[PDB]
Amino acid sequence: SGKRYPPGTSLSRDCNTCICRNSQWICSNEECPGECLVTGQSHFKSFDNRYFTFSGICQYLLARDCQDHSFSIVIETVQCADDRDAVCTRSVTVRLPGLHNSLVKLKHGAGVAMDGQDVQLPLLKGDLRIQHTVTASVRLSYGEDLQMDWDGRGRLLVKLSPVY
């Protein structure tokens, strides 16, 4: 990045480490978790660190486990200003076939609704934990291989571990 390092040093990316040896950084290639991001009006990020925008207003499929069906996420999008080019998120629906084949809903507040029922935070069920983070933002945590982020004003995030 335009700055020097002595040999033998081990700088570390978020993903893994790399070590200077004979002017050549050696590096591992071991996987590391990806993030699909929603924010702004309609600005999306892929797992593979793509950016784009698609100002569609419908119940689109954000993500899904696709060889088996451990989960599935469904954004719901809405126009969000007088302008036609202003489409922000309202809510997202999550579905866990692993537990009851339940249906979680993340609400434009910090609210959540399981199966139509509003629910206090924390929500320790067996796998999934839903608690506030700053007391202004919800965080789901299914098992260890999944996270979420507040879909109140529409800044949805995920954490998918490399098992997926």
């Binding site: 419908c58 200003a81 434009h108 609210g111």
Partner: protein
């Protein structure tokens, strides 16, 4: 009934955070969803906003 407890004056309405507030910044709870006091908000087909505690939807 005419109950007994801790209220605050009629100009002020109760907020979630233990304070009570005038109805200007009093959020909306449409579908339960806690909309901030100014939230413009709509599918293709509906059209909705939070004004003052009430959620004004249309179609």
């Amino acid at each position: 009934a005419c109950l007994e407890g801790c209220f605050c004056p009629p100009g002020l309405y109760m907020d979630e955070r233990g304070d009570c507030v005038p109805k200007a910044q009093c959020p909306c709870y449409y579908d339960g969803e806690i909309f901030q006091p100014e939230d413009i908000f709509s599918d293709h087909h509906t059209m909705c906003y939070c004004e003052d505690g009430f959620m004004h939807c249309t179609m």
